[PDB]
Design a protein around this ligand. Structure first.
Ligand SMILES: *[C@@H]1O[C@H](CO)[C@@H](O)[C@H](O)[C@H]1NC(C)=O
Ligand SMILES: *[C@@H]1O[C@H](CO)[C@@H](O)[C@H](O)[C@H]1NC(C)=O
Lengths: 185, 185
């Protein structure tokens, strides 16, 4: 009965997408789409198929097509996913002066970023990875202890986010905070 | 000036896709698309934007939008890629009886399959991989020698193709030939 194409779509936050609602029955009494998103109707055969441009999609949504055929009423849902890199990625303020032999805690804060299911927050010592974790909460915080050694000198520590959309057909988008320099003694 | 969305698309062989040709200039003297593909024109503002449904795309194509603005004439191309698993995947006919201690050659033939840039042909001994190679030519052949040992008994050999579209946002589609049993002595 009812069908929608694409059934799944990934688009940048605030973007637009074309959705086609279709129905296989001879005489559709009604065919349309239910969604609160700003919409515009275009024209194909008009009757068995309808095309809509959904615009300024700010967050995930599942618009659904529908058609009332004489045989029965059915629906078809399309899942829209919006992406955007974090609006802010920084390490919580930490004293520059740090006691040798004592423990220090790094805390990264990531505000925003979606889809969260593909966003990872990582803490680094120079170019080395210290911790990796899925981004959870708002802001998404990630923490780790670091035993201050003399080895830790002009070691710059940083936080990085990885929005990996490659499995969706796009790319990995990375972001980095300002570095933190450990001044010991 | 001219723009096209999507600028790149991957679709199954014989499928359809919606293409929107746009132009940023005030008064476009002309706006359209050049492509030999079966097309249908839908309607958005009509003037600065036009939508077309390209149908039954059988092979890769690069339809281009165009617009003649007073400022100048420009173009924008969209690259369409069609996919389809091989129409046939089999090992060249080989005698069932095979001399111990002598060399045997396996030869897989893969007819079709696209995009070829993501199709790999692999030869296997049971579930073990013996050879892997990008699919080249038509039919795409892949060969390997196998030193017949007594170890090679009711060893079934097979050929598999991997159409890896995961980097495009889809999945890996696999195909396998009939197995070949080595009857020695
Ligand atoms: C994050 O990286 C994107 C590109 O990947 C860039 O456009 C954006 O400005 C960066 N965001 C921040 C907060 O630095
Ligand atoms: C190859 O696999 C696809 C699904 O991945 C299947 O639909 C098709 O029939 C297979 N082709 C052959 C020749 O077996």
């Amino acid at each position: 009965q009812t069908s929608v194409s694409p059934s799944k779509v990934i688009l940048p936050r605030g973007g637009s997408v074309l959705v086609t609602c279709s129905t296989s029955c001879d005489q559709p009494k009604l065919l349309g789409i239910e969604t609160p998103l700003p919409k515009k109707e275009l024209l194909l055969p008009g009757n068995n198929r309808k095309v809509y441009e959904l615009s300024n999609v700010q967050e995930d949504s599942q618009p659904m097509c529908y058609s009332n055929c004489p045989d029965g009423q059915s629906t078809a849902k399309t899942f829209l996913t919006v992406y955007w890199t974090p609006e802010r990625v920084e390490l919580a303020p930490l004293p520059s002066w740090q006691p040798v032999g004592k423990q220090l805690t790094l805390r990264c804060q990531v505000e925003g970023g979606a889809p969260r299911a593909q966003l990872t927050v990582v803490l680094l010592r120079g170019e080395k990875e210290l911790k990796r974790e899925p981004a959870v909460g708002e802001p998404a915080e990630v923490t780790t202890t670091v035993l201050v050694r003399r080895d830790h000198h002009g070691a710059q520590f940083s936080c990085r986010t990885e929005l990996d959309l490659r499995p969706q057909g796009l790319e990995l988008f990375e972001n980095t905070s300002a570095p933190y320099q450990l001044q010991t003694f």
